[PDB]
Paper text:
The SHV-1:SA1-204 structure was determined at 1.53 Å resolution. The initial unbiased omit Fo-Fc map reveals a clear covalent acyl intermediate attached to the catalytic S70 residue with characteristic features including a bicyclic ring and a phenyl tail. In our study of the SHV-1: SA1-204 complex, the carbonyl oxygen of SA1-204 is positioned out of the oxyanion hole and stabilized by side chains of S130 and K234. The bicyclic ring partially occludes the oxyanion hole and makes van der Waals interactions with A237. Importantly, the C3-carboxylate group is noted to form a salt-bridge interaction with R244. Additionally, the sulfone group of SA1-204 interacts with water molecules including a water-mediated interaction with Y105. The phenyl tail of SA1-204 is in van der Waals distance with V216, A217, and L220 and is also close to a Cymal-6 molecule. Compared with apo SHV-1 structure, the most prominent movements of the active site residues are the different rotamer taken by S130 and the outward shift of the V216 containing loop to accommodate the carbonyl oxygen and the C2-methyl group of SA1-204 intermediate. Other potential reasons for the decreased deacylation rate and stability of penam sulfone intermediate include the steric and electrostatic barriers and the spatially increased distance for the approach of the deacylation water to the ester carbonyl. Firstly, in this SHV-1:penam sulfone structure, the deacylation water is positioned 4.07 Å away from the ester carbonyl carbon compared while in the usual acyl intermediate this distance is 2.8 Å.
Residue numbers in the entry: 26 to 238, 240 to 252, 254 to 292
Amino acid sequence: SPQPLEQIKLSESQLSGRVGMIEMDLASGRTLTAWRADERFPMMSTFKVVLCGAVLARVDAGDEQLERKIHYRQQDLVDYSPVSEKHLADGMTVGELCAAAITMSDNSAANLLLATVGGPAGLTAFLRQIGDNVTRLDRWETELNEALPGDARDTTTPASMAATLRKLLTSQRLSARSQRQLLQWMVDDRVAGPLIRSVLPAGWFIADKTGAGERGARGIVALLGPNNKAERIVVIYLRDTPASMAERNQQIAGIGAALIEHWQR
Ligand SMILES: OC[C@H]1O[C@H](O[C@H]2[C@H](O)[C@@H](O)[C@H](OCCCCCCC3CCCCC3)O[C@@H]2CO)[C@H](O)[C@@H](O)[C@@H]1O
Ligand SMILES: *C(=O)c1cc2ccccn2c1N[C@@H](C(=O)O)[C@](C)(COC(=O)Cc1ccccc1)S(=O)O
């Protein structure tokens, strides 16, 4: 594999799309690789990690409990509810809803949680409160995946998302337990995580949330490192490519391979 930046360029050439990327030390925030780091990309499902950060902040404040059972109706369900559709009779706890949102990409779980934090406006306010002045959520699932060209709704920048993830995971804004919970939810991805492990060399740590959208939008927020440590945050977004999902996946994997082969920088 070539150097990370050279691979990123190749990916734009092959895909005819825009790639946005940040590689950042998790402990310190040192930026290692930055490409289109200040350009806007749709968050898609990656917003769910921020959402559950906001939920945990409420838990820490005594305004929420992870144990609290939420009951909902079939009419509340939106497209793709693999966990939440199974609990119309018995409900789900707030913590279970965050697990379903993050580890199973359950859209109804995400919307139920979004309601608890004051909707898209509330989550945007939370972002402003932790010092992210760029990322914005405007819509609910699944409209937030629309990825219209030039539409600022429901977008982040790679630099903003990386900084925000680091804030939630490490800055002591969240309690120790809450930081640990948010990390464990990302470790526990039931879909991409296990497949990624199968193709990672031995010794590489992975935790992640993936996302997809219209017009080729695709992305991942990940923790990655050798020696079985979450050494770095890697944020990669793609937009405005006509390519197959398989090729978008391949290109993101290729950027990963470049990082792995050229890790010491
Ligand atoms: O010399 C370094 C390594 O080179 C190869 O490893 C390959 C591996 O066989 C391949 O499967 C992976 O693809 C990358 C797949 C990563 C999956 C997605 C990555 C995630 C991580 C967070 C951001 C991007 C998405 O690349 C590495 C590096 O070339 C060798 O197989 C391995 O023995 C050796 O230790
Ligand atoms: C966010 O999670 C999201 C947004 C969105 C829009 C349309 C369709 C699906 N979708 C998701 N979730 C999927 C995603 O692609 O991120 C999931 C998690 C499917 O995941 C994968 O396909 C990742 C993967 C790639 C290659 C190999 C193995 C796994 S969801 O549909 O289960």
